[PDB]
């Protein structure tokens, strides 16, 4: 998940 969130939309982001 450290690896996942390095290049996926951040947890708090919507739109």
């Amino acid at each position, epitope marked *: *998940l*450290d*690896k996942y*969130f*390095k*290049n*996926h*939309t*951040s*947890p*708090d*982001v919507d*739109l």
Partner: antibody, heavy 125, light 108 residues
């Protein structure tokens, strides 16, 4: 809630080294890019660099590449900005800020939220 | 780098007036423009991200629009507490850049 805490002020002499800190809380520190921005005289902001605390991968602005070092200690959810040898003209307000991102197919776009209070670094004899 | 140019550089307006600030980017940045408010002596605060998304807790009188190279920040009904410097910022391309800043002052 989400907060970045830095020191408000650091004073050093020219030629001295300095490392300032920014401690994140209220979120998972390893899951967000975090970075540093310099306040320019009067108006203006200059992005300096970012680090991903999950693995310490860094990216610098070409203006700041090789002049500063950004690092992170995920144990204590803290990012750092360091100069080896300060000049008087390095004096400035420095901000740390988290960078939320939106990505599709591994390509990410970023903004700055939230920002720490800023650290006024003064370099003077 | 992508250069962002805000217009105008200073604005003075009355409480209740509509204020509009534009940001023109030197190349396309799609919709990846954020707007910040910065009061004197204080850190910037995000107002708008992704060109038009309003940050939570930011009053609805603030709105953003645009895409490509022409973006607009609009304050629909200026309040005294809106005195600040406003910045745009592109997050599409390294290095990340900010506009030069627009000072907003209140006439009274």
């Amino acid at each position: 809630q989400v907060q970045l805490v830095e020191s408000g002020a650091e004073v050093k002499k020219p030629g001295e080294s300095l490392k300032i800190s920014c401690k994140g809380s209220g979120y998972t520190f390893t899951r967000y890019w975090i970075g540093w921005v310099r306040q320019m005289p009067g108006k203006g902001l200059e992005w300096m660099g970012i680090i991903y605390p999950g693995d310490s991968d860094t990216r610098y602005s070409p203006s700041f590449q090789g002049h500063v070092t950004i690092s992170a200690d995920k144990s204590i959810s803290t990012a750092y900005l360091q100069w080896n040898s300060l000049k008087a003209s390095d004096t400035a307000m420095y901000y740390c800020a988290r960078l939320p991102q939106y990505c599709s197919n591994g390509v990410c776009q970023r903004w700055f939220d939230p920002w720490g209070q800023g650290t006024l670094v003064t370099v003077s004899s | 780098e992508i250069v962002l140019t805000q217009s105008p550089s200073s604005v003075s307006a009355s409480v209740g007036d509509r204020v509009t600030i534009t940001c023109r980017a030197s190349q396309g940045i799609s919709s990846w423009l954020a707007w910040y408010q910065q009061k004197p002596g204080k850190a910037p605060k995000l107002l708008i991200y992704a060109a038009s998304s309003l940050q939570s807790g930011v009053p609805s009188r603030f709105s953003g629009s645009g895409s490509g190279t022409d973006f607009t920040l609009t304050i629909s009904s200026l309040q005294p507490e809106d005195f600040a410097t406003y910045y745009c910022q592109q997050g599409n391309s390294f290095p990340y850049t900010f506009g030069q800043g627009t000072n907003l002052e209140i006439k009274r």
